[PDB]
Design a protein around this ligand. Structure first.
Ligand SMILES: Cc1[nH]c(/C=C2\C(=O)N=C3CC=C(C(=O)N[C@H](C)c4ccc(F)cc4)C=C32)c(C)c1NC(=O)c1ccco1
Length: 503
């Protein structure tokens, strides 16, 4: 449901308007041709016009397909890629991989199919495209078209950019609504934070820290920030909409209470990936409880409520007795210097609670004081039942290690150590990261699973930074605004908006 004149709102500016962008955007290959979705598509499209570059894009696609193929179907897919791209007789043969590398992948196959068989090749292909082909693209009409898309991306964002609907959720500093971009029709979840409630409460550094954390991370398993704008009365955060309910509701109201181990395996895998993406920015979550794990329309989960998250300086630790009773690691309850370890304790709490249907230190039918819940977390060893496989008991016992030094995933290796745990032995993380594994529960679409100071003006400028690059470009592609607007001249000629002669 796009606006009536959405083609006028996203109307491409004349290429002459982007000269300032041309001389400020860093010409980074990985950023302009891979990370940024629209730049990626435009660079691919530029390679579509060259017969030599074409075969290199098709191969990377075929390797991406190879990485997610089942194990019993690797050798089949591997031989296909070989006899189509890496055969010197082929029509779409890759010539920029040395003859002493095509030979190696032929041996690798003879040995045994490995899911990274073409990793060496793919890297050589990128080693070639980052050179000449990339610098030719920079002087092509497709990079000028990219500058036009960046220009639109940079445009200011106000309340009139969105269409507010219904108040779906509440909390602290404000409420959570559901908004829609008028020009594209994509649904989001506004997080209206009332300004008066932030000044009176002197928590401006907490709201800015949450926005910066939300924008810096992009993950399929954490709520993403798309826009940050100020409105006269509140400071809004536009986040991923999640309409499938939260994990607490599904554990207890839809559960046994609890899930089958296999079903909990799926959610734990996605949660673990969410934590790994957060930890890549050395950011600790500290708020892992079932009601913060939300489900989307398809049944996948994202981590939500990053208001308790903080960015840990590399090589440093932090203090903070924060979180929810029952979901605080011992090092947090003791108010010690900790790192990312609280999140792996939380992950243990979640896996246990999903399988067993209750918290590892508080029975569902038990009524105990906050103090006794902490004593158990610090002294009592949790007990397991026949709902847990030996592998499930293991990973939970290791993640619930009282000593953060011996806790799983809390070594220099990080989330990788948790992904090898026998509990995930039947989990293909590559296919999960690529969205190829069907969720165990698909929500029904029609479901309802539920003052004039200047220092304030300086705090609003650092917050209301506008649209977020990657989410915005993804919004354009998903809504098919990119497909419809990204048109050129007939027979590969310059369109008017890209011709500097007549503006
Ligand atoms: C559209 C919609 N959006 C949300 C909330 C979210 C969403 O999507 N994505 C995030 C990210 C992050 C948060 C978050 O910070 N939460 C904490 C506590 C918080 C903090 C401060 C506040 F002022 C308020 C809340 C919330 C959300 C919900 C729950 C729904 N509707 C349903 O799920 C639903 C449909 C039918 C039956 O139920």
């Amino acid at each position: 449901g796009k606006s009536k004149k959405w083609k006028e709102i996203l109307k491409f500016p004349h290429i002459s308007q982007c000269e300032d962008l041309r001389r400020t955007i860093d010409r980074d290959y990985c950023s302009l041709c891979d990370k940024q979705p629209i730049g990626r598509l435009l660079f691919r499209q530029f390679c579509e016009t060259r017969p030599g570059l074409e075969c290199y894009i098709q191969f990377l696609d075929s390797v991406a397909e190879y990485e997610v193929t089942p194990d019993e179907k690797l050798g089949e897919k591997g031989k296909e890629i070989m006899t189509k791209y890496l055969t010197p007789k082929s029509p779409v043969f890759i010539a920029q991989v040395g003859q002493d590398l095509v030979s190696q992948t032929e041996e690798k196959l003879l040995q045994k199919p490995c899911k990274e068989l073409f990793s060496a090749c793919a890297q050589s292909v990128h080693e070639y495209l980052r050179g000449e082909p990339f610098h030719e693209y920079l002087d092509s009409m497709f990079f000028d078209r990219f500058l036009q898309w960046k220009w639109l991306e940079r445009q200011p964002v106000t309340k009139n950019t969105f269409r507010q609907y219904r108040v779906l959720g509440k909390g602290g500093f404000g409420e959570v609504c559901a908004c829609q971009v008028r020009a594209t029709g994509k649904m989001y979840a506004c997080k209206r934070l009332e300004k008066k409630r932030i000044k009176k409460r002197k928590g401006e550094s907490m709201a800015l820290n949450e926005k910066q954390i939300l924008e810096k991370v992009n993950s399929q398993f954490v709520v993403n920030l798309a826009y940050a704008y100020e409105t006269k009365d509140a400071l809004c955060l536009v986040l991923t909409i999640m309409n499938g309910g939260d994990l607490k509701f599904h554990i207890y109201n839809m559960g046994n209470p609890g899930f089958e181990e296999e079903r909990a395996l799926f959610y734990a895998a996605e949660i673990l990936c969410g934590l790994e993406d957060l930890h890549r920015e050395n950011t600790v979550y500290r708020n892992l409880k079932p009601e913060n794990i939300l489900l989307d329309d398809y049944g996948h989960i994202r981590i939500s409520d990053l208001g308790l998250a903080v960015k840990i300086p590399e090589g440093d630790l932090i203090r903070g007795r924060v979180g929810t009773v029952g979901y605080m690691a011992p090092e947090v309850l003791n108010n010690q210097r900790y790192g990312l370890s609280p999140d792996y304790w939380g992950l243990g709490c979640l896996i246990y609670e999903m399988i067993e249907g209750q918290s590892p230190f508080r029975g569902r039918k038990e009524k105990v004081k906050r103090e006794e819940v902490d004593r158990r977390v610090l002294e009592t060893e949790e007990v397991y039942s026949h709902k847990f496989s030996e592998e499930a008991k293991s990973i939970c016992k290791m993640l619930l290690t009282k000593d953060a030094k011996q806790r799983l995933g809390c070594q220099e290796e990080g989330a990788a150590e948790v992904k090898r745990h026998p509990f995930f032995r039947n989990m293909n993380f590559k296919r999960l990261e690529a969205g190829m594994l069907d969720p165990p529960f698909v929500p029904d679409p029609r479901a309802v699973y539920c003052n004039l100071d200047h220092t304030d003006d300086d705090f609003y400028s650092k917050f209301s930074t506008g649209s977020v690059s990657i989410p915005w470009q993804n919004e354009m592609i998903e809504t098919e605004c990119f497909k419809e607007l990204n048109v050129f001249g007939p027979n590969g000629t310059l369109p008017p908006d890209l011709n500097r002669n007549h503006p």
